[PDB]
Design a protein around this ligand. Structure first.
Ligand SMILES: O=C(c1cccc(O)c1)c1c(-c2ccc(O)cc2)sc2cc(O)ccc12
Ligand SMILES: O=C(c1cccc(O)c1)c1c(-c2ccc(O)cc2)sc2cc(O)ccc12
Lengths: 156, 156
C-alpha cells in the first residue's frame, strides 16, 4: 500500500540519522544538533534527582554541545545496536559509552557505562532523543560514594 | 518468502508472550517462569554495584518469584509500550512500575520507577529478560540517602 511505502521509506532514512548520531565524535559533535528538528529535545533521563535533564530546542542543543565537548572531551559510543520498531519514527539503541569526565569541581576521571537511547523522528529529523543509564557508574567516575543496598537478608 | 513468513509468525507469537509477561500480577507471578526456556535468564541489570543480578534457569526463576511475591507483594507494571524490532525474537518495553517494597531490614516503603525491559526469545519462549531502571529511585523508596552531583558549575 501507499502507507506501507511511506512507512518503509521513513524508517530507512531515520535509521541512517540514528547511525550518524551514534558515530558523531570529536569536533563533529558541535554540529550534531543539525540532526534535530528546530523544536527537538535531547538529554539525560536518568539522574540522581529523578528528573530528566532535557535540552529543549535545536539552538540550545548546539549550545550544550560546546559544554559537553569540554566536559566529555573524547566521548565515544561503542557496541552500538540499533533497533527499528513497528513505528517507523521510533528507534531504540543499546550501546556502551566511554571517555574522560571533566566535570566542574570534581577530579578528572574516566567514565564508562551502558546506555539505552530512544530516538523519535518527525519529518526526517530527531524530535526527541533520550538517554538512560545507571547513575551509580557516573558517581563512581566522579569519586562520589555509592550507597550499598544491604543484601544480608536476600536469597543468594 | 518462506523466511519472511517464519519471521512474521515468530514476532506475532512473541509479542503475545511479552504482553502476558507485562500483565502478570498477583499470584499468577508464581507461574511467570513458565514463559521462559528451561535455561532462560531474567533479572535486574542496573544495581548499586554495577553488576547485573541475573537469575539463571527456569527453575531458579520460579523460586525467585516466591521471594519477589513477599518483598514486592502488589507490584504492577503500568504505561506499557511494547516495541517489536527487526529481529522477530527481540522486543523492548518501556513502562513504569509501582508497588510496596518490603525489603529485608528496611522500613516498608512505596516504590515507583520508570523501566525499560529487553526480551529475547528462542523457540516461542523467553531466553533472556533484562530490566533497566535508575537505582536512585529504589534507594529513595528504601530511605537510603542518594548523593547529589553538585551542579553549581554547570550551565543552567
Ligand atoms: O552528565 C550530565 C548531563 C546531563 C544532560 C546532558 C549532558 O550532556 C550531561 C549531568 C548533569 C548536567 C546538568 C546540566 C548540564 O548543563 C550539564 C550536565 S547533572 C547530572 C546529575 C547526575 O546524577 C548525573 C548526570 C548529570
Ligand atoms: O531489587 C532487587 C532485585 C534484583 C533482582 C531481581 C529482583 O526481583 C529484585 C535488588 C537485589 C536483590 C538481589 C538478590 C535477590 O535475591 C533479591 C533482590 S540487590 C539490589 C541492589 C540495588 O541497588 C537495587 C536493587 C536490588
Amino acid at each position: 500500500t501507499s502507507e506501507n511505502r511511506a512507512q518503509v521509506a521513513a524508517r530507512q532514512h531515520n535509521r541512517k540519522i540514528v547511525e550518524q548520531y551514534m558515530h558523531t565524535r570529536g569536533e563533529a559533535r558541535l554540529k550534531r544538533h543539525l540532526l534535530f528538528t528546530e523544536d527537538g529535545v535531547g538529554g539525560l533521563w536518568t539522574t540522581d534527582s529523578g528528573q530528566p535533564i532535557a535540552i529543549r530546542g535545536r539552538e540550545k542543543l548546539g549550545e550544550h554541545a560546546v559544554w559537553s565537548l569540554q566536559c566529555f572531551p573524547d566521548w565515544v559510543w561503542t557496541d552500538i545496536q540499533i533497533f527499528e520498531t513497528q513505528d517507523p519514527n521510533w528507534f531504540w539503541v543499546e550501546c556502551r559509552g566511554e571517555g574522560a569526565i571533566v566535570f566542574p569541581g570534581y577530579p578528572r576521571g574516566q567514565y564508562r557505562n551502558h546506555f539505552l537511547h530512544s530516538f523519535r523522528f518527525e519529518n526526517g529529523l530527531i524530535k526527541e532523543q533520550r538517554e538512560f543509564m545507571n547513575p551509580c557508574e557516573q558517581f563512581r567516575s566522579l569519586g562520589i560514594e555509592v550507597p550499598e543496598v544491604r543484601r544480608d537478608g536476600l536469597p543468594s
